[PDB]
Amino acid sequence: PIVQNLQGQMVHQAISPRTLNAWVKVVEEKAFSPEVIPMFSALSEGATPQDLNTMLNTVAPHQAAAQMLKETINEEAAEWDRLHPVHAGPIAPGQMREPRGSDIAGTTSTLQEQIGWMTHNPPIPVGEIYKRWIILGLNKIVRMYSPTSILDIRQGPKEPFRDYVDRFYKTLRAEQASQEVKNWMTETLLVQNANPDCKTILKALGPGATLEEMMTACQGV
Amino acid sequence: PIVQNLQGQMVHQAISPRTLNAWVKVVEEKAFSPEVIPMFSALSEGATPQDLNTMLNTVAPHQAAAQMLKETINEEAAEWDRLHPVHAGPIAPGQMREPRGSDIAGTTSTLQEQIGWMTHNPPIPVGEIYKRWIILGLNKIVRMYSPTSILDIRQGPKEPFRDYVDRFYKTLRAEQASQEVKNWMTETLLVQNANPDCKTILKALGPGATLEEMMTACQGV
Numbered sequence: 001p002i003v004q005n006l007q008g009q010m011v012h013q014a015i016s017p018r019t020l021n022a023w024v025k026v027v028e029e030k031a032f033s034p035e036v037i038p039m040f041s042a043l044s045e046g047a048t049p050q051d052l053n054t055m056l057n058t059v060a061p062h063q064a065a066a067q068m069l070k071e072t073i074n075e076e077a078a079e080w081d082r083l084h085p086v087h088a089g090p091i092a093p094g095q096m097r098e099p100r101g102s103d104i105a106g107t108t109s110t111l112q113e114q115i116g117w118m119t120h121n122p123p124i125p126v127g128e129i130y131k132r133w134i135i136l137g138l139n140k141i142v143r144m145y146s147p148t149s150i151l152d153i154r155q156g157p158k159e160p161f162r163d164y165v166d167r168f169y170k171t172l173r174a175e176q177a178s179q180e181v182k183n184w185m186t187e188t189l190l191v192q193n194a195n196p197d198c199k200t201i202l203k204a205l206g207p208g209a210t211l212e213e214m215m216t217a218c219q220g221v
Numbered sequence: 222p223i224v225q226n227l228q229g230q231m232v233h234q235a236i237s238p239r240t241l242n243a244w245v246k247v248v249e250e251k252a253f254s255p256e257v258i259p260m261f262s263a264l265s266e267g268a269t270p271q272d273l274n275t276m277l278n279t280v281a282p283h284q285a286a287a288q289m290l291k292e293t294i295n296e297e298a299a300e301w302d303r304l305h306p307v308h309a310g311p312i313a314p315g316q317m318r319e320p321r322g323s324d325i326a327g328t329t330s331t332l333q334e335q336i337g338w339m340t341h342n343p344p345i346p347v348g349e350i351y352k353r354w355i356i357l358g359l360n361k362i363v364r365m366y367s368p369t370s371i372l373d374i375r376q377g378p379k380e381p382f383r384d385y386v387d388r389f390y391k392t393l394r395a396e397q398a399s400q401e402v403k404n405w406m407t408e409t410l411l412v413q414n415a416n417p418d419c420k421t422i423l424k425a426l427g428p429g430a431t432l433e434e435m436m437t438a439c440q441g442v
């Protein structure tokens with residue numbers, strides 16, 4: 001992250017060891033479940049690209065996930081270079097150069113370059129964009145490691161309706177289908193895969209019932 | 222039917238043999254089920270009263286049905302004579318006489334008389350009125366031959382709801398109750414005679430639900 005020194009100048013502060021250890025616990029203990037992404041986003045809050053690569057070292061022992069992340073990051077860097085062609089010409093002395101795809105990812109840049117790029121009015125946030133690339137890679141990894149299809153999430157004969165709903169929506173978060181397909185899933189498949197008593201009540205409830213009304217009508221069933 | 226010759230004059234064309242054979246198949250194979258009436262109406266499309274009597278010969282071997290048709294036709298002819306008293310007086314040379322009940326049914330008229338009566342501006346359609354009398358007779362015949370009461374149409378334990386609905390409405394078409402009684406039947410008896418699971422859902426659906434909503438809520442039940 002970025003901190004101000006006693007003289008009012010922006011200084012890079014490394015991630016503290018217990019934050020890094022929290023991220024290591026997330027990576028090594030949670031099997032890339034969907035909650036790895038909110039936790040990563042919280043733990044890399046306000047980070048520089050050099051900090052993000054420190055957090056990416058924890059993924060390297062997981063070769064398939066690390067390779068998927070590398071492919072996503074290379075694709076994003078190439079796309080960034082294509083959409084930001086390197087202008088050839090003079091530059092104002094008070095203006096800094098334009099980082100490349102290998103620079104936003106911190107492969108060839110240095111710490112002061114990233115601090116200066118991020119600390120500006122108006123800012124060009126290099127940490128947030130690299131973070132979004134990482135999150136796309138992690139979404140792909142969560143999709144790859146998902147153990148069940150949404151078609152296989154079915155309410156047990158004695159399972160409470162809220163628990164089935166939580167499992168259903170967690171798998172839906174993992175699968176990341178298209179928006180229209182997701183709407184069809186939540187409207188139709190949730191009712192279709194409920195157990196007989198809840199299914200009877202939900203069918204009687206009619207189409208277009210909100211999830212809150214469905215939870216109300218199935219509370220003790 | 223009526224066709225125009227090469228000189229532009231209206232000429233009667235007989236019913237083709239395969240149309241008559243289609244009507245014979247309807248009469249001899251369908252046991253006077255309710256669909257005999259739409260089929261008869263389609264097959265006698267644009268017919269003259271002389272054509273209608275050719276189609277009525279097919280019914281003559283069925284003595285009860287033929288007698289019911291004859292009674293209905295005699296009643297309609299008598300009513301037509303009563304509501305159209307034979308005016309005694311001069312008639313315009315450019316105006317034709319008024320057919321009687323025995324003439325619209327083609328018992329005493331001739332082909333040219335019927336062609337001239339039907340081909341006029343404005344027309345006096347003798348084929349359509351005789352056809353409506355025939356249809357009243359056929360409705361009575363369909364009522365007589367109906368095998369089941371509407372009170373006896375009950376959904377089977379595994380019967381799909383759409384099939385029960387189709388049987389119910391077909392019997393209702395056969396029975397031809399009064400309009401208010403029919404509305405009571407479709408609103409109350411259909412729900413009352415459904416099987417337990419569909420009945421539970423329909424009772425939960427509430428009064429005044431449309432048939433489409435009932436079909437939606439019972440699709441796989």
Ligand SMILES: O=P(O)(O)O[C@H]1[C@H](OP(=O)(O)O)[C@@H](OP(=O)(O)O)[C@H](OP(=O)(O)O)[C@@H](OP(=O)(O)O)[C@H]1OP(=O)(O)O
Nearest residue numbers: 222224234235236237238239240241242243263264266267
């Ligand atoms: O309206 P319909 O009286 O039933 O007329 C049809 C129709 O003939 P037209 O349209 O020429 O009057 C058929 O023609 P398609 O368009 O089906 O071809 C024809 O069948 P063919 O094509 O075999 O000529 C058929 O004639 P057919 O009796 O030989 O089956 C004939 O029926 P009618 O002869 O009873 O008028």
